[PDB]
RNA sequence: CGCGACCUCAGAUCAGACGUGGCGACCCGCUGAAUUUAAGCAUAUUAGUCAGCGGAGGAAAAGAAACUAACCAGGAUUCCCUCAGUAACGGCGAGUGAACAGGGAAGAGCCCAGCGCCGAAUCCCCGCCCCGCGGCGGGGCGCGGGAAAUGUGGCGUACGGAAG
């Protein structure tokens, strides 16, 4: 499909983040917390949520 | 606070973190169009120290001025006159490309007012500037006392009288002994005060 | 065959009455007025002719709104009031 | 007789429109008299009938728009014919409330450090 | 031109109604300085523009 | 779900009608081209009354913004007579001269004696 | 083409000078406008000094003029602090302040501190609401006799 | 695959607003010549002038020092007298040419971002009640909707400031 130019842009930007040599300061955010640790951290942080208005 | 780290991080620009960031942003900004709205500032600390408080009614644009000097807009060669004014190709323009950026941003939006602007990227053939714009007839702007100065008719199109910071850098003013040819209101006012006979009544 | 016998072919006209300035200067092939530049949003005006300025500035025509705003300014734009009746 | 816009004002809407209607009829009959060639009385009278139509229509439009702004008295958005039509910059001028708003910095400065009332012995 | 447009014909209608002379009950007025219609126009001599 | 045609086209979205919180102009403007202002006076020329006698028409001077249908309904409301047809022109003075052919039911010399022209 | 003997000179009329010539026929209209404005301001600040605030002894800078004392811009912060006057209360009770002035001597500082104490002796501060006097307000005997002094308040002569 | 967040971005005759254009004497930004003078002329001069273009206001701009100074030191900006046809520039030819200081007109100072500490303490909009309404504003109630943590408000700004 001839995609729109914004769809083309936001896809091939991610292609460039796969291509270019990403420095480690920006690389460290693709190494992320795995799923069964993230869900127990969120069920801990659900206890301490700030107050609704 | 985070903004101190953000300003020192933006200060280090040949650091490969910031070379990667400015390169990828500049790629994306060339793929985009010339005068398009940015949804939020790219440099929030620079925006906040130039005047942007992230409330309703402030608008960031992201504009692309084409990079280069200024060749003289004459037919083929042919400036018909004395050999001082023969030159066309190596001429430079009196105002910064940052000011030209604020100018065409505030021309494209005439209902808004150019607060200030900053730098985001460059390459060989374009420079990119993000412009801060205040909508004066919004009431979060009009009911706040220390920003309802923008809502007055004197401040109409600041970028074209040359009153934002990128325009003030090109008028040659400021205190000093370096700035004698603007004393008075401006350079033209200096010249006009100097080249008039004050022919008194009693001489 | 340059003069009198070439003034005979003058039968198809160039300009016509413009519809912003009322003068017969609206060109038909360029379709722009010569005295005011009609399809431009801005009135054609130059400083090398102060006489072409003074032929139509604010004072020339009727000032159908602006003389009324002058005599409203001399009482400072009162609205909603009437004088007290008899 | 001599129609006057003093006593056309309590007159209600359909009665004013019937007055307008037979004034229009009378003006058209006087115009036919003008074309066929009538008398100086009717040729004088057509001005009286035209200004009669004028002040009947004046009373109609005034009494309509008085009711319109009395209908839109309390409301927040009201039509552009009913808004105050002063000059454009004077409508885009800030309000006498909004230009009276002072920040709390200068509220407290005007509290603590008021302008004083002094005089100097010579 | 018998193929007139409406604006042209309207303009010509105004000029030929303006082309009438002075009414003779004017030159007995008190503050008068008029003796004829100076702005007249004969169709051979002056060609009206357009 | 699949895309067969390789052209992306804009998704058809929902657009509401105006629900304005106040009318722009308050009261609608009165019809200034009404049935009295549309026809002004009839002609009483020798040609016009030759046509009243022979062709069973009346001859009127109406204003330029008229229609044939408008002055047809005008003569029908002002003089209570129906109209066969209407033929209009713009005089060189600037007015719109109309020729109102009545029905064979009615007679224009009678209606002219009614409305004064003779 | 000069004559026999005479000063050869450079008149600066080679430009277009007639288009830019400022003639002074509104000189006396300007003087009357200024003194009308001066009378209006001097009566609208009604017991306060017409000359404005008080301004310090300060000494002219250079080698040509350092023997001369003028009236300056405003009292320095060091001077106000030694005279006890708060830097925001001074502008209200009638004292001019500038924050930019240094003090590199002691003679000039003691002159200005003495001048501030002399001013606080001389001034008559009316109460804030007149029916309710307060502590730092002058007495009702001299509240009636307070008036505008014309000329510069405590003039500086050399 | 579907659902739900957020992010980038579109369409609305969506609700409410706003800019366009004119005059243009004075003002701000840019562009900007050649006549003319040099007894020619090319650098200069005319001249940052005319013409061109954009933008305002009742005045505009400037303005509270990354200043002047070199003194026993002055102290925002603007204007006037003077400095001074001086220092200086210039085929050092013709021509060009400021500022400091001093005397006067006037006189006024201030606010952010950052560093912080306060449960976002903040702002806009819809609906109803009361008041006032021809500068749509004040008070109350909404388990009303948004903005905002990618930072609003309060204290605080180089004259230091905050906490105890
Ligand atoms: Mg030359
Ligand atoms: Mg610079
Ligand atoms: Mg042609
Ligand atoms: Mg123009
Ligand atoms: Mg002929
Ligand atoms: Mg001789
Ligand atoms: Mg809408
Ligand atoms: Mg020469
Ligand atoms: Mg010569
Ligand atoms: Mg020559
Ligand atoms: Mg030059
Ligand atoms: Mg010009
Ligand atoms: Mg404009
Ligand atoms: Mg104006
Ligand atoms: Mg100003
Ligand atoms: Mg100075
Ligand atoms: Mg001398
Ligand atoms: Mg030489
Ligand atoms: Mg020069
Ligand atoms: Mg000086
Ligand atoms: Mg004085
Ligand atoms: Mg603050
Ligand atoms: Mg904050
Ligand atoms: Mg400072
Ligand atoms: Zn035209």
Curated annotation (Swiss-Prot), chain B:
Comp. bias (Basic residues): 168-181
Subunit field text: Component of the large ribosomal subunit. Interacts with IFIT1 (via TPR repeats 1-4).
NCBIfam families: PRK04243.1
Organism this protein belongs to: Oryctolagus cuniculus (Rabbit)
PANTHER family membership: LARGE RIBOSOMAL SUBUNIT PROTEIN EL15, RIBOSOMAL PROTEIN L15
Localization per record: Cytoplasm
Keywords noted in UniProt: Cytoplasm, Isopeptide bond, Lipoprotein, Myristate, Phosphoprotein, Ribonucleoprotein, Ribosomal protein, Ubl conjugation
Family: Belongs to the eukaryotic ribosomal protein eL15 family.
Gene: RPL15
A Gene Ontology molecular function term of the record: RNA binding
Identification of the protein by name: Large ribosomal subunit protein eL15
GO cellular component, one term: cytosolic large ribosomal subunit
InterPro entries, alphabetized: Rbsml_eL15_core_dom_sf, Ribosomal_eL15, Ribosomal_eL15_CS, Ribosomal_uL23/eL15/eS24_sf
Swiss-Prot record, chain C:
GO annotations of cellular component type: cytosolic large ribosomal subunit; synapse
Modified residues (N6-acetyllysine): 9
InterPro entries per UniProt: Ribosomal_eL37, Ribosomal_eL37/eL43, Ribosomal_eL37_CS, Ribosomal_zn-bd
Keywords in alphabetical order: Acetylation, Cytoplasm, Metal-binding, Phosphoprotein, Ribonucleoprotein, Ribosomal protein, RNA-binding, rRNA-binding, Zinc, Zinc-finger
Molecular function (Gene Ontology), one example: zinc ion binding
Cellular compartment(s): Cytoplasm
GO biological process: positive regulation of signal transduction by p53 class mediator; translation
Zinc finger (C4-type): 18-36
Broad class of where this protein is predominantly found: cytoplasm
UniProt binding sites for Zn(2+): 18, 21, 33, 36
Subunit field text: Component of the large ribosomal subunit.
Family stated for the protein in its record: Belongs to the eukaryotic ribosomal protein eL37 family.
HAMAP family xref list: Ribosomal_eL37
Record function comment: Component of the large ribosomal subunit. The ribosome is a large ribonucleoprotein complex responsible for the synthesis of proteins in the cell.
Protein name as catalogued: Large ribosomal subunit protein eL37
Organism: Oryctolagus cuniculus (Rabbit)
Lineage of the organism: Eukaryota, Metazoa, Chordata, Craniata, Vertebrata
Gene: RPL37
Curated annotation (Swiss-Prot), chain D:
Region of interest: Disordered: 84-122
Annotated localization: Cytoplasm
InterPro entries in the cross-refs: Ribosomal_uL29 (IPR001854), Ribosomal_uL29_CS (IPR018254), Ribosomal_uL29_euk (IPR045059), Ribosomal_uL29_sf (IPR036049)
Domain of life the protein comes from: Eukaryota
GO biological process, one term: translation
GO cellular component, one term: cytosolic large ribosomal subunit
Residue numbers carrying Phosphoserine: 28
Modified sites of kind N6-acetyllysine: 18, 42
A single MF term (Gene Ontology): structural constituent of ribosome
Known function: Component of the large ribosomal subunit. The ribosome is a large ribonucleoprotein complex responsible for the synthesis of proteins in the cell.
Subunit structure: Component of the large ribosomal subunit.
Protein name per UniProt: Large ribosomal subunit protein uL29
Organism this protein belongs to: Oryctolagus cuniculus (Rabbit)
Gene transcribed to yield this protein: RPL35
């Amino acid at each position: 499909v001839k995609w729109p130019r914004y769809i083309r842009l936001q896809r091939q930007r991610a292609i460039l983040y796969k291509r270019l040599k990403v420095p480690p300061a920006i690389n460290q955010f693709t190494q992320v917390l795995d799923r069964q640790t993230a869900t127990q951290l969120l069920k801990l942080a659900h206890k301490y949520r700030p107050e609704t208005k | 606070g985070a903004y101190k780290y953000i300003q020192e991080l933006w200060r280090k620009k040949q650091s490969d973190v910031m070379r990667f960031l400015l390169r990828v942003r500049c790629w994306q900004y060339r793929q985009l169009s010339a005068l398009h709205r940015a949804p939020r500032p790219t440099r929030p600390d620079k925006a906040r120290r130039l005047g942007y408080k992230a409330k309703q009614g402030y608008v960031i644009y992201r504009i692309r001025v084409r990079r280069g000097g200024r060749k003289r807009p004459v037919p083929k060669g042919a400036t018909y006159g004395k050999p001082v004014h023969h030159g066309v190709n190596q001429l430079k323009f009196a105002r910064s490309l940052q000011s030209v950026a604020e100018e065409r941003a505030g021309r494209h939006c005439g209902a808004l007012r150019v607060l200030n602007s900053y730098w985001v990227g460059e390459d060989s053939t374009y420079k990119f500037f993000e412009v801060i714009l205040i909508d004066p007839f919004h009431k979060a702007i009009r009911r706040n006392p220390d920003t309802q100065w923008i809502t007055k008719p004197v401040h109409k199109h600041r970028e074209m009288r040359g009153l934002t910071s990128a325009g003030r850098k090109s008028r040659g003013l400021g205190k000093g002994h370096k700035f004698h040819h603007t004393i008075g209101g401006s350079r033209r006012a200096a010249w006009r005060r100097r080249n008039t006979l004050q022919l008194h009544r009693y001489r | 065959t340059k003069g009198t016998s070439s003034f005979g072919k003058r039968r198809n006209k160039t300009h016509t009455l413009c519809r912003r300035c009322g003068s017969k200067a609206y060109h038909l092939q360029k379709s722009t007025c010569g005295k005011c530049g009609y399809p431009a949003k801005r009135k054609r005006k130059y400083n090398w002719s102060a006489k072409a300025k003074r032929r139509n500035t604010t004072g020339t025509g009727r000032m159908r709104h602006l003389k009324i705003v002058y005599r409203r300014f001399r009482h400072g734009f009162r609205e909603g009031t009437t004088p007290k009746p008899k | 007789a001599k129609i006057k816009a003093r006593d056309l004002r309590g007159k209600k809407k359909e009665e004013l429109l019937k007055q307008l209607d037979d004034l229009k009829v009378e003006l058209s009959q006087l115009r036919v008299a003008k074309v066929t060639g009538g008398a100086a009385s009717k040729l004088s009278k057509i001005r009286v009938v035209r200004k009669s139509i004028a002040r009947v229509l004046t009373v109609i439009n005034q009494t309509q728009k008085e009711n319109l702004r009395k209908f839109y008295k309390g409301k927040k958005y009201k039509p552009l014919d009913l808004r105050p039509k002063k000059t454009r910059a004077m409508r885009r001028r800030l309000n006498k409330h909004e230009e009276s708003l002072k920040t709390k910095k200068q509220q407290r400065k005007e509290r603590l450090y008021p302008l004083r009332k002094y005089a100097v012995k010579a | 031109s018998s193929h007139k447009t409406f604006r042209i014909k309207r303009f010509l209608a105004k000029k030929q109604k303006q082309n009438r002379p002075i009414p003779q009950w004017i030159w007995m007025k008190t503050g008068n300085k008029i003796r004829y219609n100076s702005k007249r126009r004969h169709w051979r001599r002056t060609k009206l523009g357009l | 779900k699949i895309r067969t045609s390789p052209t992306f086209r804009r998704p058809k979205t929902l657009r509401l009608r105006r629900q304005p919180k106040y009318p722009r102009k308050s009261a609608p403007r009165r019809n200034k081209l009404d049935h009295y202002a549309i026809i002004k006076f009839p002609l009483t020329t020798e040609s016009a009354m030759k046509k009243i006698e022979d062709n069973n028409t009346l001859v009127f001077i109406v204003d330029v913004k008229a229609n044939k249908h408008q002055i047809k309904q005008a003569v029908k409301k002002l003089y209570d007579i129906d109209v066969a047809k209407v033929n209009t022109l713009i005089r060189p003075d600037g007015e719109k001269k109309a020729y109102v052919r009545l029905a064979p039911d009615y007679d224009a010399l009678d209606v002219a004696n009614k409305i004064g022209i003779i | 083409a000069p004559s026999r003997n005479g000063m050869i000179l450079k008149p600066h009329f080679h430009k277009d000078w007639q288009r830019r010539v400022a003639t002074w026929f509104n000189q006396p209209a300007r003087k009357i406008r200024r003194r009308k404005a001066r009378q209006a301001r001097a009566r609208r600040i009604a017991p306060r000094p017409a000359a404005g605030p008080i301004r310090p002894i300060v000494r002219c800078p250079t080698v040509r003029y350092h023997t001369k004392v003028r009236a300056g811009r405003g009292f320095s912060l060091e001077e106000l602090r030694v005279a006890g006057i708060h830097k925001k209360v001074a502008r209200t009770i009638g004292i001019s302040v500038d924050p930019r002035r240094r003090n590199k001597s002691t003679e000039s500082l003691q002159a200005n501190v003495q001048r501030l104490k002399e001013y606080r002796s001389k001034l008559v501060l009316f109460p804030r609401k007149p029916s309710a006097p307060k502590k730092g307000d002058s007495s009702a005997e001299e509240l009636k006799l307070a008036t505008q002094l014309t000329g510069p308040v405590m003039p500086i002569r050399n």
